[PDB]
């Protein structure tokens, strides 16, 4: 009404995936909220369960407005992901901190001009090990992909010896880079 919000550079949508074995993967995927301001990002993040508190087999996906969080999207089909794989102990210590850091790298456009290659990020909550990934639009764009990977690893504070991998969605559905 009176309060003036702070526009984000991009418009965003948060998706939720509920594991129901009877349904298709696409049917289990739901858009839960759209936002495009700093205030609306924090209001959403404060009004949903932390990744660490999700039921096993569930996902959150944050994608630029108009990009669906699936391989088949025009903006994802030629692309790939920087993948962080967590062990079972890291669910309590690192999952939420790493996911929030990933969300802030996205809405804060933290890869400068290379942020234009970012489509979104996905957290997979899994018994066998949690996964966080930043999805980029073109697995051939080695300049953008290598920069995003280096800065992402810096922002997460991962030790040098924890090597993270970039996989194309084409390869997942059937590492192109590491840092």
């Amino acid at each position: 009404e009176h309060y003036i919000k702070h526009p984000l550079q991009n418009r965003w949508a948060l998706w939720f995936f509920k594991n129901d074995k009877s349904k298709t993967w696409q049917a289990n995927l739901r858009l839960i909220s759209k936002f495009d301001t700093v205030e609306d990002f924090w209001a959403l993040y404060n009004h949903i369960q932390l990744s660490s508190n999700l039921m096993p087999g569930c996902d959150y996906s944050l994608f630029k407005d108009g990009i669906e969080p699936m391989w088949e999207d025009e903006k994802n089909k030629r692309g790939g992901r920087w993948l962080i794989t967590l062990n079972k102990q890291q669910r309590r210590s690192d999952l939420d901190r790493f996911w929030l850091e990933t969300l802030l790298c996205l809405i804060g456009e933290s890869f400068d001009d290379y942020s234009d290659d970012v489509c979104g990020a996905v957290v997979n909550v899994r018994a066998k090990g949690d996964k966080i990934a930043i999805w980029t639009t073109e697995c051939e764009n080695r300049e953008a992909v290598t920069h995003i990977g280096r800065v992402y690893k810096e922002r997460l504070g991962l030790p040098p010896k924890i090597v993270i991998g970039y996989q194309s969605h084409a390869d997942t559905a059937t590492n192109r880079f590491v840092v």
């Binding site: 009176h2 309060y3 702070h6 205030e39 993040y45 404060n46 929030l100 802030l104 804060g108």
Partner: protein
């Protein structure tokens, strides 16, 4: 009430002058959070100025203002203040109050502003312009 942060008290002063800034906050309690003064000058990054936790009265300051600036609070009026003594040209900026997001409140305000700048505040006012000039 709707959340508002209304900063006021800015103006034009000559070097050595003083101003007292106010931020009248509505819709959340300053007794349940820290509040930061931050400032934005042309051609510069967002700069953290000072933090107060009104519940405890705990305060901290940027090296650039320590001894000249005093952050304070009136919990009953849900208002925070910045007393700015012996202002210099380099203090010219828009001054804002922000609430850092609860999920980032374990980080130092210097870390939050350096890493997340504006993105680390779940609310921030439109601020008050402070201009220190003799020429």
């Amino acid at each position: 009430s709707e959340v508002q942060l209304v900063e006021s008290g800015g103006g034009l002063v000559q070097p050595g002058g003083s101003l007292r800034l106010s931020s009248a906050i509505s819709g959340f309690s300053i007794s349940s959070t820290s509040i930061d003064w931050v400032r934005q000058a042309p051609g510069k990054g967002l700069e953290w100025v000072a933090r107060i936790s009104p519940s405890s009265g705990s305060t901290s300051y940027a090296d650039s203002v320590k001894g000249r600036f005093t952050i304070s609070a009136d919990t009953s009026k849900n208002t925070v203040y910045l007393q700015m003594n012996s202002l210099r040209a380099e203090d010219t900026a828009v001054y804002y109050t922000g609430r850092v997001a609860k999920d980032l409140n374990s980080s130092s305000p210097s870390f939050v502003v350096n890493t997340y700048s504006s993105f680390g505040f779940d609310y921030r006012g439109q601020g008050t312009l402070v201009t220190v000039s003799s020429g």
